[PDB]
Amino acid sequence: MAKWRCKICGYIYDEDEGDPDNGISPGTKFEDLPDDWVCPLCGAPKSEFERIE
Ligand SMILES: [Fe+3]
Protein backbone atom coordinates (compact mmCIF):
# COMPACT_ATOMS: atom_id res chain seq x y z
CA MET A 1 0.00 0.00 0.00
CA ALA A 2 0.96 3.74 -0.06
CA LYS A 3 3.31 5.83 2.13
CA TRP A 4 2.42 9.39 2.98
CA ARG A 5 5.06 11.83 4.37
CA CYS A 6 4.49 14.81 6.68
CA LYS A 7 6.15 17.83 5.07
CA ILE A 8 6.66 19.51 8.42
CA CYS A 9 8.61 16.77 10.26
CA GLY A 10 9.17 13.87 7.84
CA TYR A 11 7.07 11.32 9.68
CA ILE A 12 5.86 8.62 7.29
CA TYR A 13 2.46 7.07 7.58
CA ASP A 14 2.75 3.62 6.02
CA GLU A 15 -0.75 2.19 5.27
CA ASP A 16 0.71 -1.27 5.76
CA GLU A 17 1.73 -0.46 9.33
CA GLY A 18 -1.04 1.95 10.29
CA ASP A 19 -0.75 3.87 13.58
CA PRO A 20 -1.59 1.28 16.34
CA ASP A 21 -0.76 3.62 19.20
CA ASN A 22 -3.69 5.80 18.16
CA GLY A 23 -6.00 2.88 17.41
CA ILE A 24 -5.31 2.67 13.67
CA SER A 25 -4.69 -0.93 12.70
CA PRO A 26 -2.37 -2.10 9.93
CA GLY A 27 -3.85 -1.79 6.48
CA THR A 28 -5.83 1.43 6.97
CA LYS A 29 -5.71 3.80 3.96
CA PHE A 30 -4.68 7.41 4.51
CA GLU A 31 -8.12 8.48 3.21
CA ASP A 32 -9.79 6.40 5.94
CA LEU A 33 -7.91 8.09 8.80
CA PRO A 34 -10.25 10.36 10.81
CA ASP A 35 -10.60 13.86 9.33
CA ASP A 36 -8.95 15.35 12.41
CA TRP A 37 -6.09 12.80 12.65
CA VAL A 38 -2.77 14.62 13.02
CA CYS A 39 0.91 13.75 12.58
CA PRO A 40 1.87 11.83 15.74
CA LEU A 41 5.21 13.59 15.97
CA CYS A 42 4.52 17.24 15.14
CA GLY A 43 0.71 17.58 15.15
CA ALA A 44 0.35 18.74 11.55
CA PRO A 45 -3.00 18.02 9.82
CA LYS A 46 -3.54 15.58 6.90
CA SER A 47 -3.26 18.47 4.45
CA GLU A 48 0.49 18.67 5.18
CA PHE A 49 1.15 15.06 3.99
CA GLU A 50 2.05 14.06 0.47
CA ARG A 51 2.22 10.63 -1.07
CA ILE A 52 5.77 9.43 -1.65
CA GLU A 53 4.97 5.88 -2.71
FE1 LIG B 1 4.78 15.77 11.25
From Swiss-Prot:
GO terms (molecular function) for this protein are: electron transfer activity; iron ion binding
Domain called Rubredoxin-like: residue spans: 1-52
Which residues make up the binding site for Fe cation? C6, C9, C39, C42
Per UniProt, the cofactor note for this protein states:
Binds 1 Fe(3+) ion per subunit.
Question: Which keywords does this Swiss-Prot/TrEMBL entry list?
Answer: Electron transport, Iron, Metal-binding, Transport
Q: Per the UniProt entry, what is one GO biological process?
A: alkane catabolic process
| Pfam families associated with the record | Rubredoxin (PF00301)
Q: Which domain of life is it from?
A: Archaea
Q: Which cofactor does it need?
A: Fe(3+)
UniProt lists the family membership as follows: Belongs to the rubredoxin family.
What biological function has been recorded for the protein in this entry?
Rubredoxin is a small nonheme, iron protein lacking acid-labile sulfide. Its single Fe, chelated to 4 Cys, functions as an electron acceptor and may also stabilize the conformation of the molecule.
Q: Give the protein's recorded name.
A: Rubredoxin
User: What is the species of this protein?
Assistant: Pyrococcus abyssi (strain GE5 / Orsay)
